Protein backbone atom coordinates (compact mmCIF):
# COMPACT_ATOMS: atom_id res chain seq x y z
CA UNK A 1 0.00 0.00 0.00
CA UNK A 2 1.25 3.48 -0.88
CA UNK A 3 -1.67 5.87 -0.39
CA UNK A 4 -1.22 8.75 2.07
CA UNK A 5 -2.11 8.42 5.73
CA UNK A 6 -3.70 10.95 8.04
CA UNK A 7 -3.51 10.72 11.83
CA UNK A 8 -5.43 12.53 14.59
CA UNK A 9 -4.41 12.18 18.23
CA UNK A 10 -5.95 13.29 21.52
CA UNK A 11 -4.11 13.08 24.84
CA UNK A 12 -5.75 13.92 28.17
CA UNK A 13 -2.84 14.19 30.58
CA UNK A 14 -2.83 14.31 34.38
CA UNK A 15 0.36 15.34 36.22
CA UNK A 16 0.65 14.65 39.95
CA UNK A 17 3.15 16.16 42.39
CA UNK A 18 3.31 14.77 45.93
CA UNK A 19 0.28 12.68 45.13
CA UNK A 20 -2.90 14.61 44.54
CA UNK A 21 -1.73 17.66 46.50
CA UNK A 22 -0.68 19.38 43.26
CA UNK A 23 -2.30 18.35 39.97
CA UNK A 24 -2.02 19.82 36.48
CA UNK A 25 -4.44 18.87 33.69
CA UNK A 26 -3.79 19.05 29.95
CA UNK A 27 -6.31 18.50 27.14
CA UNK A 28 -4.18 18.02 24.01
CA UNK A 29 -5.23 17.61 20.37
CA UNK A 30 -2.72 16.55 17.71
CA UNK A 31 -2.90 16.47 13.93
CA UNK A 32 -0.31 13.93 12.67
CA UNK A 33 2.43 14.63 15.29
CA UNK A 34 1.79 18.38 15.87
CA UNK A 35 -0.24 19.80 18.79
CA UNK A 36 -2.64 22.45 17.52
CA UNK A 37 -4.91 23.25 20.50
CA UNK A 38 -4.46 22.75 24.24
CA UNK A 39 -6.23 23.38 27.54
CA UNK A 40 -3.85 23.95 30.45
CA UNK A 41 -5.35 24.08 33.93
CA UNK A 42 -2.67 26.65 34.74
CA UNK A 43 -3.92 28.80 31.87
CA UNK A 44 -7.61 28.17 32.46
CA UNK A 45 -8.81 28.23 28.86
CA UNK A 46 -8.18 26.50 25.57
CA UNK A 47 -5.25 28.07 23.76
CA UNK A 48 -4.06 27.45 20.23
CA UNK A 49 -0.61 25.92 19.93
CA UNK A 50 -0.42 26.51 16.18
CA UNK A 51 -2.69 28.46 13.86
CA UNK A 52 -4.25 25.14 12.84
CA UNK A 53 -6.04 25.03 16.16
CA UNK A 54 -7.09 28.66 16.41
CA UNK A 55 -10.60 27.79 15.09
CA UNK A 56 -11.22 25.30 17.91
CA UNK A 57 -9.94 27.53 20.71
CA UNK A 58 -12.42 30.32 19.93
CA UNK A 59 -15.24 27.81 19.48
CA UNK A 60 -14.66 25.71 22.58
CA UNK A 61 -14.05 28.62 24.94
CA UNK A 62 -17.43 30.09 23.89
CA UNK A 63 -19.49 26.96 24.55
CA UNK A 64 -21.77 27.09 27.54
CA UNK A 65 -20.55 25.10 30.56
CA UNK A 66 -17.19 24.36 28.93
CA UNK A 67 -14.74 26.34 31.04
CA UNK A 68 -16.47 25.32 34.26
CA UNK A 69 -16.22 21.71 33.16
CA UNK A 70 -12.58 21.98 32.18
CA UNK A 71 -11.45 24.16 35.09
CA UNK A 72 -12.82 21.45 37.40
CA UNK A 73 -11.18 18.56 35.56
CA UNK A 74 -8.29 18.31 38.06
CA UNK A 75 -10.83 17.34 40.71
CA UNK A 76 -13.49 15.55 38.67
CA UNK A 77 -11.13 13.75 36.30
CA UNK A 78 -7.46 13.80 37.32
CA UNK A 79 -7.77 13.36 41.07
CA UNK A 80 -10.63 10.90 40.74
CA UNK A 81 -8.77 8.57 38.38
CA UNK A 82 -5.70 8.65 40.63
CA UNK A 83 -7.68 7.05 43.42
CA UNK A 84 -9.39 4.47 41.25
CA UNK A 85 -6.06 2.83 40.51
CA UNK A 86 -3.99 3.96 43.47
CA UNK A 87 -3.92 0.51 45.10
CA UNK A 88 -2.45 -1.23 42.05
CA UNK A 89 -0.48 1.57 40.37
CA UNK A 90 0.89 4.14 42.83
CA UNK A 91 1.04 1.52 45.58
CA UNK A 92 2.21 -1.36 43.38
CA UNK A 93 5.64 -2.73 44.75
CA UNK A 94 7.38 -5.74 43.19
CA UNK A 95 10.59 -7.07 44.77
CA UNK A 96 13.25 -7.91 42.18
CA UNK A 97 15.24 -11.07 41.47
CA UNK A 98 19.00 -10.53 41.46
CA UNK A 99 21.36 -12.84 39.58
CA UNK A 100 25.14 -12.46 39.42
CA UNK A 101 27.31 -14.10 36.77
CA UNK A 102 30.39 -13.31 34.64
CA UNK A 103 30.89 -12.55 30.94
CA UNK A 104 35.73 -13.60 32.22
CA UNK A 105 36.97 -10.07 32.89
CA UNK A 106 33.35 -8.87 32.99
CA UNK A 107 31.01 -9.47 35.93
CA UNK A 108 27.30 -8.62 35.70
CA UNK A 109 24.53 -8.05 38.25
CA UNK A 110 21.12 -8.62 36.62
CA UNK A 111 18.09 -7.14 38.40
CA UNK A 112 14.82 -8.30 36.88
CA UNK A 113 11.09 -7.93 37.32
CA UNK A 114 10.63 -5.02 39.72
CA UNK A 115 8.15 -2.20 40.11
CA UNK A 116 8.37 0.75 40.27
CA UNK A 117 11.32 1.81 38.15
CA UNK A 118 13.18 3.63 40.92
CA UNK A 119 16.16 1.51 41.93
CA UNK A 120 19.69 1.97 43.20
CA UNK A 121 22.29 -0.73 42.52
CA UNK A 122 25.84 -0.52 43.87
CA UNK A 123 28.85 -2.82 43.58
CA UNK A 124 31.03 -3.72 46.58
CA UNK A 125 34.52 -5.29 46.62
CA UNK A 126 35.35 -6.49 50.15
CA UNK A 127 33.22 -3.68 51.51
CA UNK A 128 34.76 -1.21 49.05
CA UNK A 129 32.51 0.22 46.33
CA UNK A 130 34.39 0.36 43.03
CA UNK A 131 33.10 3.43 41.19
CA UNK A 132 35.09 3.02 37.96
CA UNK A 133 34.46 0.57 35.16
CA UNK A 134 30.80 0.37 36.20
CA UNK A 135 28.53 0.16 33.15
CA UNK A 136 24.75 -0.16 33.24
CA UNK A 137 22.26 -0.90 30.48
CA UNK A 138 20.08 1.72 32.10
CA UNK A 139 16.54 1.09 33.21
CA UNK A 140 14.47 -0.73 30.59
CA UNK A 141 10.69 -1.01 30.70
CA UNK A 142 9.51 -4.55 30.04
CA UNK A 143 6.07 -3.37 29.03
CA UNK A 144 4.30 -5.75 31.43
CA UNK A 145 4.40 -3.49 34.51
CA UNK A 146 7.88 -4.72 35.52
CA UNK A 147 11.37 -3.33 35.01
CA UNK A 148 14.84 -4.77 34.70
CA UNK A 149 18.41 -3.53 34.55
CA UNK A 150 21.92 -4.90 34.09
CA UNK A 151 24.81 -3.18 35.89
CA UNK A 152 28.28 -4.56 35.25
CA UNK A 153 31.69 -3.94 36.82
CA UNK A 154 34.73 -4.79 34.68
CA UNK A 155 37.01 -6.27 37.33
CA UNK A 156 39.92 -8.71 37.55
CA UNK A 157 38.21 -12.04 38.28
CA UNK A 158 40.36 -13.57 41.01
CA UNK A 159 39.63 -16.01 43.83
CA UNK A 160 40.14 -13.48 46.60
CA UNK A 161 37.82 -10.68 47.64
CA UNK A 162 34.09 -11.37 47.94
CA UNK A 163 31.91 -9.48 45.48
CA UNK A 164 28.47 -8.37 46.67
CA UNK A 165 25.83 -6.66 44.52
CA UNK A 166 23.59 -4.38 46.59
CA UNK A 167 20.19 -3.16 45.35
CA UNK A 168 17.80 -0.71 46.98
CA UNK A 169 14.16 -0.60 45.98
CA UNK A 170 10.96 0.97 47.33
CA UNK A 171 9.59 -2.55 47.76
CA UNK A 172 12.22 -3.48 50.37
CA UNK A 173 12.81 -1.89 53.76
CA UNK A 174 16.40 -3.15 53.80
CA UNK A 175 18.96 -3.39 51.00
CA UNK A 176 19.27 -6.70 49.21
CA UNK A 177 22.68 -8.23 48.65
CA UNK A 178 23.82 -11.10 46.46
CA UNK A 179 27.32 -12.46 47.05
CA UNK A 180 29.83 -14.00 44.67
CA UNK B 1 4.47 11.24 44.78
CA UNK B 2 5.36 12.30 41.18
CA UNK B 3 3.20 10.45 38.60
CA UNK B 4 1.56 11.01 35.19
CA UNK B 5 -1.71 9.51 33.90
CA UNK B 6 -2.55 9.92 30.21
CA UNK B 7 -5.70 8.96 28.31
CA UNK B 8 -4.43 8.46 24.78
CA UNK B 9 -6.59 8.18 21.67
CA UNK B 10 -5.97 8.21 17.97
CA UNK B 11 -7.70 7.60 14.66
CA UNK B 12 -5.86 6.81 11.41
CA UNK B 13 -7.01 7.24 7.81
CA UNK B 14 -7.55 5.70 5.33
CA UNK B 15 -7.04 2.62 7.46
CA UNK B 16 -10.00 3.60 9.63
CA UNK B 17 -8.22 2.42 12.75
CA UNK B 18 -8.51 3.76 16.28
CA UNK B 19 -7.36 2.94 19.78
CA UNK B 20 -8.18 4.14 23.29
CA UNK B 21 -5.83 3.50 26.21
CA UNK B 22 -4.82 4.68 29.67
CA UNK B 23 -1.12 5.10 30.50
CA UNK B 24 0.35 5.22 34.02
CA UNK B 25 4.03 6.22 34.14
CA UNK B 26 4.62 4.54 30.80
CA UNK B 27 2.60 1.35 31.34
CA UNK B 28 -0.83 0.49 29.95
CA UNK B 29 -3.60 0.33 32.53
CA UNK B 30 -6.14 -0.79 29.97
CA UNK B 31 -7.26 -0.34 26.41
CA UNK B 32 -10.64 -0.63 24.74
CA UNK B 33 -11.05 -3.23 22.03
CA UNK B 34 -12.95 -1.40 19.32
CA UNK B 35 -14.17 -4.59 17.66
CA UNK B 36 -15.60 -6.42 20.65
CA UNK B 37 -16.36 -3.14 22.47
CA UNK B 38 -14.69 -4.58 25.60
CA UNK B 39 -12.26 -3.14 28.15
CA UNK B 40 -9.03 -5.13 28.13
CA UNK B 41 -6.87 -4.75 31.22
CA UNK B 42 -3.12 -5.10 30.80
CA UNK B 43 -2.96 -7.24 33.93
CA UNK B 44 -5.91 -9.48 34.74
CA UNK B 45 -5.79 -8.41 38.39
CA UNK B 46 -6.55 -4.80 37.42
CA UNK B 47 -10.06 -5.79 36.39
CA UNK B 48 -10.90 -6.89 39.90
CA UNK B 49 -10.14 -3.56 41.58
CA UNK B 50 -11.32 -1.09 38.93
CA UNK B 51 -13.81 -0.84 36.08
CA UNK B 52 -14.42 1.24 32.97
CA UNK B 53 -17.40 1.53 30.64
CA UNK B 54 -16.07 0.96 27.13
CA UNK B 55 -19.11 2.76 25.74
CA UNK B 56 -17.44 6.12 26.44
CA UNK B 57 -14.33 5.15 24.54
CA UNK B 58 -16.25 4.22 21.41
CA UNK B 59 -17.95 7.60 21.59
CA UNK B 60 -14.57 9.30 21.85
CA UNK B 61 -13.21 7.46 18.85
CA UNK B 62 -16.19 8.45 16.75
CA UNK B 63 -15.41 12.08 17.57
CA UNK B 64 -11.76 11.65 16.65
CA UNK B 65 -12.79 10.09 13.33
CA UNK B 66 -15.00 13.06 12.43
CA UNK B 67 -12.47 15.58 13.67
CA UNK B 68 -9.78 13.95 11.53
CA UNK B 69 -11.74 14.71 8.37
CA UNK B 70 -12.09 18.29 9.56
CA UNK B 71 -8.43 18.61 10.40
CA UNK B 72 -7.36 17.01 7.14
CA UNK B 73 -9.24 19.80 5.33
CA UNK B 74 -7.70 22.45 7.58
CA UNK B 75 -4.18 21.37 6.63
CA UNK B 76 -5.07 21.32 2.93
CA UNK B 77 -4.62 17.55 2.95
CA UNK B 78 -1.02 17.35 4.14
CA UNK B 79 -0.25 13.68 4.87
CA UNK B 80 1.73 12.27 7.74
CA UNK B 81 5.46 11.74 7.22
CA UNK B 82 6.56 8.18 7.88
CA UNK B 83 9.11 7.57 10.63
CA UNK B 84 10.90 4.21 10.65
CA UNK B 85 10.93 2.22 13.90
CA UNK B 86 13.78 1.24 16.20
CA UNK B 87 13.59 -2.48 16.94
CA UNK B 88 15.32 -4.14 19.89
CA UNK B 89 15.17 -7.78 20.99
CA UNK B 90 15.89 -8.97 24.52
CA UNK B 91 14.69 -11.34 27.22
CA UNK B 92 13.10 -10.65 30.57
CA UNK B 93 15.46 -12.97 32.48
CA UNK B 94 19.02 -14.24 32.13
CA UNK B 95 19.02 -17.08 29.63
CA UNK B 96 19.59 -20.59 30.99
CA UNK B 97 19.35 -23.79 28.97
CA UNK B 98 15.97 -25.53 29.26
CA UNK B 99 14.59 -22.84 31.61
CA UNK B 100 11.50 -21.02 30.28
CA UNK B 101 12.03 -17.44 29.21
CA UNK B 102 10.37 -14.80 27.03
CA UNK B 103 11.79 -12.85 24.11
CA UNK B 104 10.74 -9.20 23.92
CA UNK B 105 10.72 -7.40 20.58
CA UNK B 106 10.48 -3.69 21.38
CA UNK B 107 9.47 -1.42 18.51
CA UNK B 108 10.00 2.23 19.26
CA UNK B 109 9.88 5.76 17.85
CA UNK B 110 7.69 5.20 14.81
CA UNK B 111 4.66 6.65 13.08
CA UNK B 112 2.06 5.95 11.65
CA UNK B 113 0.94 3.16 13.94
CA UNK B 114 0.82 0.33 11.40
CA UNK B 115 3.33 -2.51 11.71
CA UNK B 116 3.69 -6.12 10.62
CA UNK B 117 5.61 -8.15 13.21
CA UNK B 118 6.57 -11.81 12.83
CA UNK B 119 8.57 -14.11 15.11
CA UNK B 120 11.03 -16.23 13.12
CA UNK B 121 12.58 -19.31 14.71
CA UNK B 122 15.39 -20.59 12.49
CA UNK B 123 13.96 -18.55 9.63
CA UNK B 124 10.44 -19.95 9.91
CA UNK B 125 7.45 -18.04 11.33
CA UNK B 126 6.24 -18.82 14.85
CA UNK B 127 2.95 -17.76 16.48
CA UNK B 128 2.51 -20.38 19.23
CA UNK B 129 2.30 -18.51 22.52
CA UNK B 130 3.05 -15.07 21.09
CA UNK B 131 1.37 -11.92 22.33
CA UNK B 132 1.61 -8.19 21.81
CA UNK B 133 0.53 -4.85 23.19
CA UNK B 134 -1.44 -2.07 21.59
CA UNK B 135 0.28 1.04 20.29
CA UNK B 136 1.61 2.96 23.26
CA UNK B 137 2.09 6.74 23.34
CA UNK B 138 5.33 8.69 23.49
CA UNK B 139 6.31 12.13 24.73
CA UNK B 140 7.32 13.09 21.18
CA UNK B 141 3.96 11.68 20.01
CA UNK B 142 5.35 8.74 18.12
CA UNK B 143 4.50 5.20 19.17
CA UNK B 144 6.04 2.18 20.84
CA UNK B 145 5.04 -1.47 20.99
CA UNK B 146 5.96 -4.75 22.67
CA UNK B 147 5.83 -8.28 21.25
CA UNK B 148 6.47 -11.38 23.35
CA UNK B 149 7.52 -14.92 22.44
CA UNK B 150 7.81 -17.42 25.29
CA UNK B 151 10.45 -19.99 24.46
CA UNK B 152 12.69 -22.66 25.90
CA UNK B 153 16.34 -21.60 25.39
CA UNK B 154 18.50 -24.00 23.44
CA UNK B 155 21.78 -23.97 21.59
CA UNK B 156 20.03 -25.23 18.45
CA UNK B 157 17.40 -22.53 17.92
CA UNK B 158 17.95 -18.94 16.77
CA UNK B 159 15.38 -16.18 16.63
CA UNK B 160 14.60 -13.01 14.73
CA UNK B 161 11.94 -10.31 14.96
CA UNK B 162 10.76 -9.15 11.53
CA UNK B 163 9.15 -5.70 11.58
CA UNK B 164 7.52 -4.17 8.50
CA UNK B 165 6.78 -0.46 8.31
CA UNK B 166 6.26 2.15 5.64
CA UNK B 167 9.33 4.11 6.74
CA UNK B 168 11.43 1.04 6.02
CA UNK B 169 12.39 0.15 2.47
CA UNK B 170 12.84 -3.52 3.41
CA UNK B 171 11.79 -5.63 6.40
CA UNK B 172 13.88 -5.26 9.56
CA UNK B 173 15.23 -8.30 11.40
CA UNK B 174 16.76 -8.29 14.88
CA UNK B 175 18.53 -11.51 15.80
CA UNK B 176 19.20 -13.40 19.04
CA UNK B 177 21.18 -16.58 19.83
CA UNK B 178 22.74 -18.55 22.74
CA UNK C 1 -13.81 2.04 41.44
CA UNK C 2 -14.87 3.25 38.01
CA UNK C 3 -12.58 5.20 35.71
CA UNK C 4 -14.00 8.32 34.07
CA UNK C 5 -13.12 9.28 30.46
CA UNK C 6 -12.53 12.78 29.46
CA UNK C 7 -14.88 13.20 26.53
CA UNK C 8 -13.56 14.16 23.11
CA UNK C 9 -14.79 17.50 21.82
CA UNK C 10 -16.10 18.08 18.31
CA UNK C 11 -13.96 20.44 16.24
CA UNK C 12 -15.27 23.60 14.65
CA UNK C 13 -16.42 23.58 11.05
Amino acid at each position, epitope marked *: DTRPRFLEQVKHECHFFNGTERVRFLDRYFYHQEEYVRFDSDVGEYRAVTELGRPDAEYWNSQKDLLEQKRAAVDTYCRHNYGVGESFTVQRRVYPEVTVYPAHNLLVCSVNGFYPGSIEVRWFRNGQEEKTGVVSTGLIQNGDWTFQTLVMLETVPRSGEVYTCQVEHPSLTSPLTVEW | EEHVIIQAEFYLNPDQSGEFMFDFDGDEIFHVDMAKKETVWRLEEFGRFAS*F*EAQGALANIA*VDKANLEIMTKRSNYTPITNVPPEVTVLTNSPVELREPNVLICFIDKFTPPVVNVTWLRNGKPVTTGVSETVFLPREDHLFRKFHYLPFLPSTEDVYDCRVEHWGLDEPLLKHWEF | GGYRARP*AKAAAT
Partner: T-cell receptor, first 112, second 112 residues
Framework: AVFQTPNYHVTQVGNEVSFNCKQT?????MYWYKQDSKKLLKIMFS???????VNETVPRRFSPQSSDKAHLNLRIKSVEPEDSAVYLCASSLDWGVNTLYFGAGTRLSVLE | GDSVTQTEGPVTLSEGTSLTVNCSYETKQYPTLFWYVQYPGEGPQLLFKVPKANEKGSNRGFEATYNKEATSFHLQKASVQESDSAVYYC???????????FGTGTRLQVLP
Protein backbone atom coordinates in the same frame (compact mmCIF):
# COMPACT_ATOMS: atom_id res chain seq x y z
CA ALA D 1 -31.21 28.00 23.11
CA VAL D 2 -33.21 24.91 22.16
CA PHE D 3 -36.03 25.19 19.60
CA GLN D 4 -38.49 22.45 18.63
CA THR D 5 -41.17 22.13 15.96
CA PRO D 6 -43.99 21.68 15.92
CA ASN D 7 -45.44 23.04 19.11
CA TYR D 8 -48.66 21.03 18.73
CA HIS D 9 -49.77 18.21 16.43
CA VAL D 10 -52.79 15.93 16.18
CA THR D 11 -53.01 12.93 13.90
CA GLN D 12 -54.66 9.57 13.48
CA VAL D 13 -53.41 6.17 14.54
CA GLY D 14 -51.15 4.73 11.86
CA ASN D 15 -49.82 8.01 10.52
CA GLU D 16 -46.25 9.27 10.40
CA VAL D 17 -45.06 12.19 12.53
CA SER D 18 -41.84 14.17 12.32
CA PHE D 19 -40.40 16.43 15.05
CA ASN D 20 -37.38 18.67 14.69
CA CYS D 21 -34.95 20.29 17.12
CA LYS D 22 -32.09 22.79 16.97
CA GLN D 23 -29.73 24.02 19.68
CA THR D 24 -27.43 27.02 19.41
CA UNK D 25 -25.37 26.35 22.51
CA UNK D 26 -22.52 24.76 20.62
CA UNK D 27 -23.08 21.44 22.36
CA UNK D 28 -22.07 18.06 20.97
CA UNK D 29 -24.88 15.98 22.52
CA MET D 30 -28.68 16.15 22.05
CA TYR D 31 -31.53 14.11 23.54
CA TRP D 32 -35.17 13.26 23.03
CA TYR D 33 -37.31 12.74 26.11
CA LYS D 34 -40.91 11.62 26.52
CA GLN D 35 -43.03 13.29 29.22
CA ASP D 36 -46.41 11.90 30.13
CA SER D 37 -49.54 12.99 32.00
CA LYS D 38 -48.17 11.73 35.32
CA LYS D 39 -44.97 13.81 34.90
CA LEU D 40 -42.78 10.83 34.05
CA LEU D 41 -39.74 12.14 32.19
CA LYS D 42 -37.88 9.25 30.51
CA ILE D 43 -35.19 9.12 27.83
CA MET D 44 -35.67 7.97 24.26
CA PHE D 45 -32.54 8.73 22.25
CA SER D 46 -29.23 10.41 22.67
CA UNK D 47 -26.91 11.58 19.93
CA UNK D 48 -23.35 12.82 20.28
CA UNK D 49 -21.82 14.38 17.16
CA UNK D 50 -24.23 12.67 14.75
CA UNK D 51 -23.67 9.25 16.39
CA UNK D 52 -26.23 7.27 18.38
CA UNK D 53 -25.30 6.77 22.04
CA VAL D 54 -28.41 5.88 24.04
CA ASN D 55 -31.50 4.10 22.73
CA GLU D 56 -34.23 3.14 25.19
CA THR D 57 -37.08 3.04 22.70
CA VAL D 58 -38.87 0.00 21.33
CA PRO D 59 -36.84 -1.77 18.63
CA ARG D 60 -37.91 -0.24 15.30
CA ARG D 61 -40.88 2.08 15.65
CA PHE D 62 -38.89 5.31 15.65
CA SER D 63 -36.33 6.87 13.34
CA PRO D 64 -34.11 9.58 14.78
CA GLN D 65 -31.84 11.57 12.54
CA SER D 66 -29.04 14.09 13.02
CA SER D 67 -27.54 15.57 9.88
CA ASP D 68 -25.62 18.04 12.07
CA LYS D 69 -24.52 18.13 15.70
CA ALA D 70 -26.89 21.08 16.22
CA HIS D 71 -29.93 19.30 14.75
CA LEU D 72 -31.80 16.31 16.15
CA ASN D 73 -34.95 15.09 14.45
CA LEU D 74 -37.41 12.42 15.50
CA ARG D 75 -39.77 10.40 13.30
CA ILE D 76 -42.53 8.01 14.35
CA LYS D 77 -43.37 5.64 11.53
CA SER D 78 -46.82 4.58 12.73
CA VAL D 79 -48.32 6.29 15.74
CA GLU D 80 -50.16 4.44 18.44
CA PRO D 81 -52.56 6.07 20.89
CA GLU D 82 -49.91 5.55 23.59
CA ASP D 83 -47.64 7.96 21.70
CA SER D 84 -49.71 10.91 22.95
CA ALA D 85 -47.32 12.85 25.16
CA VAL D 86 -45.02 15.86 25.32
CA TYR D 87 -41.69 15.28 23.58
CA LEU D 88 -38.83 17.39 24.89
CA CYS D 89 -35.52 17.97 23.19
CA ALA D 90 -32.41 18.52 25.31
CA SER D 91 -28.72 19.31 24.82
CA SER D 92 -25.57 18.87 26.88
CA LEU D 93 -21.98 20.05 26.43
CA ASP D 94 -20.73 16.55 25.68
CA TRP D 95 -21.63 12.99 26.49
CA GLY D 96 -20.27 13.03 30.03
CA VAL D 97 -22.22 14.13 33.08
CA ASN D 98 -23.59 17.61 32.36
CA THR D 99 -26.55 19.90 32.76
CA LEU D 100 -29.43 19.28 30.34
CA TYR D 101 -30.89 22.22 28.43
CA PHE D 102 -34.47 21.61 27.30
CA GLY D 103 -36.81 22.98 24.68
CA ALA D 104 -40.40 24.06 25.05
CA GLY D 105 -41.70 20.63 24.11
CA THR D 106 -43.89 19.19 21.35
CA ARG D 107 -47.40 18.19 22.36
CA LEU D 108 -48.56 15.23 20.25
CA SER D 109 -52.07 13.81 20.33
CA VAL D 110 -52.72 10.51 18.54
CA LEU D 111 -56.38 9.71 17.98
CA GLU D 112 -58.27 6.69 16.68
CA GLY E 1 -30.75 -0.17 38.48
CA ASP E 2 -30.49 3.57 39.08
CA SER E 3 -33.73 4.90 40.51
CA VAL E 4 -35.03 8.11 42.03
CA THR E 5 -38.02 8.41 44.33
CA GLN E 6 -39.62 11.77 45.07
CA THR E 7 -42.52 13.00 47.11
CA GLU E 8 -45.79 11.64 45.78
CA GLY E 9 -48.74 13.68 44.63
CA PRO E 10 -49.23 17.43 44.41
CA VAL E 11 -48.14 19.73 47.21
CA THR E 12 -50.10 22.89 47.98
CA LEU E 13 -48.77 25.50 50.40
CA SER E 14 -49.57 29.02 51.49
CA GLU E 15 -46.78 31.39 50.67
CA GLY E 16 -44.29 31.89 53.46
CA THR E 17 -44.34 28.25 54.41
CA SER E 18 -41.12 26.28 54.52
CA LEU E 19 -40.91 23.54 51.85
CA THR E 20 -39.48 20.01 51.85
CA VAL E 21 -39.51 17.71 48.81
CA ASN E 22 -38.09 14.36 49.80
CA CYS E 23 -35.82 12.64 47.29
CA SER E 24 -34.16 9.26 47.80
CA TYR E 25 -31.89 7.72 45.18
CA GLU E 26 -30.30 4.30 44.72
CA THR E 27 -27.28 3.56 42.55
CA LYS E 28 -24.19 1.35 42.45
CA GLN E 29 -22.07 4.08 40.82
CA TYR E 30 -20.91 7.44 42.15
CA PRO E 31 -23.47 9.96 40.94
CA THR E 32 -24.00 13.66 40.76
CA LEU E 33 -27.46 14.82 41.78
CA PHE E 34 -29.67 17.49 40.25
CA TRP E 35 -32.87 19.36 40.90
CA TYR E 36 -34.85 20.49 37.87
CA VAL E 37 -37.78 22.89 37.89
CA GLN E 38 -40.45 23.17 35.20
CA TYR E 39 -42.44 26.39 35.33
CA PRO E 40 -45.85 26.50 33.59
CA GLY E 41 -45.59 26.68 29.85
CA GLU E 42 -41.86 26.04 29.78
CA GLY E 43 -39.57 23.05 29.62
CA PRO E 44 -37.43 21.70 32.45
CA GLN E 45 -34.64 23.85 33.79
CA LEU E 46 -31.72 23.23 36.12
CA LEU E 47 -32.24 24.46 39.65
CA PHE E 48 -28.85 23.33 40.95
CA LYS E 49 -26.52 20.35 40.84
CA VAL E 50 -24.16 18.82 43.36
CA PRO E 51 -21.31 16.75 41.95
CA LYS E 52 -19.52 16.06 45.28
CA ALA E 53 -20.63 13.40 47.75
CA ASN E 54 -21.42 15.48 50.80
CA GLU E 55 -21.93 19.02 49.50
CA LYS E 56 -24.76 21.52 49.33
CA GLY E 57 -26.62 23.03 46.38
CA SER E 58 -28.60 26.25 46.47
CA ASN E 59 -30.51 28.45 44.02
CA ARG E 60 -33.53 30.78 44.22
CA GLY E 61 -33.74 30.22 47.95
CA PHE E 62 -33.88 26.48 47.43
CA GLU E 63 -31.34 24.20 49.01
CA ALA E 64 -30.54 20.49 49.10
CA THR E 65 -27.62 18.53 50.54
CA TYR E 66 -26.34 15.35 48.85
CA ASN E 67 -26.43 12.92 51.75
CA LYS E 68 -24.53 9.85 50.62
CA GLU E 69 -24.98 8.13 53.97
CA ALA E 70 -28.76 8.37 53.69
CA THR E 71 -28.83 8.46 49.85
CA SER E 72 -31.04 11.51 49.97
CA PHE E 73 -31.26 14.87 48.25
CA HIS E 74 -34.24 16.50 49.94
CA LEU E 75 -35.14 19.92 48.55
CA GLN E 76 -35.94 22.64 51.06
CA LYS E 77 -36.92 26.31 51.08
CA ALA E 78 -37.80 28.32 54.17
CA SER E 79 -40.45 30.60 52.63
CA VAL E 80 -42.02 29.65 49.28
CA GLN E 81 -43.36 32.36 47.00
CA GLU E 82 -46.26 32.29 44.58
CA SER E 83 -43.70 32.36 41.76
CA ASP E 84 -42.39 28.98 42.90
CA SER E 85 -45.44 27.10 41.59
CA ALA E 86 -43.97 24.57 39.16
CA VAL E 87 -42.98 20.92 38.86
CA TYR E 88 -39.75 19.94 40.61
CA TYR E 89 -37.70 17.00 39.39
CA CYS E 90 -35.00 15.29 41.41
CA UNK E 91 -32.49 13.45 39.26
CA UNK E 92 -29.23 11.59 39.43
CA UNK E 93 -26.69 10.68 36.84
CA UNK E 94 -23.55 8.57 37.13
CA UNK E 95 -20.38 10.58 37.11
CA UNK E 96 -18.78 8.59 34.28
CA UNK E 97 -21.47 9.34 31.68
CA UNK E 98 -24.58 11.43 31.20
CA UNK E 99 -27.32 8.90 31.93
CA UNK E 100 -29.86 11.03 33.78
CA UNK E 101 -32.68 9.29 35.63
CA PHE E 102 -35.52 11.58 36.67
CA GLY E 103 -37.98 11.12 39.47
CA THR E 104 -41.72 11.29 39.14
CA GLY E 105 -41.90 15.03 39.55
CA THR E 106 -43.88 16.77 42.27
CA ARG E 107 -46.11 19.67 41.35
CA LEU E 108 -45.91 22.51 43.86
CA GLN E 109 -48.75 25.02 44.03
CA VAL E 110 -48.20 28.08 46.22
CA LEU E 111 -51.39 29.93 47.15
CA PRO E 112 -51.43 33.60 48.16
Amino acid sequence: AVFQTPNYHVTQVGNEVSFNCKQTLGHDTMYWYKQDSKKLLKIMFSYNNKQLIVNETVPRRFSPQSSDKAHLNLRIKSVEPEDSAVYLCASSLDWGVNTLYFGAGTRLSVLE
Amino acid sequence: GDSVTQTEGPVTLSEGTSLTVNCSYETKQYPTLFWYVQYPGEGPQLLFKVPKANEKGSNRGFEATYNKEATSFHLQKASVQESDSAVYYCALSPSNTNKVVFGTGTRLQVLP
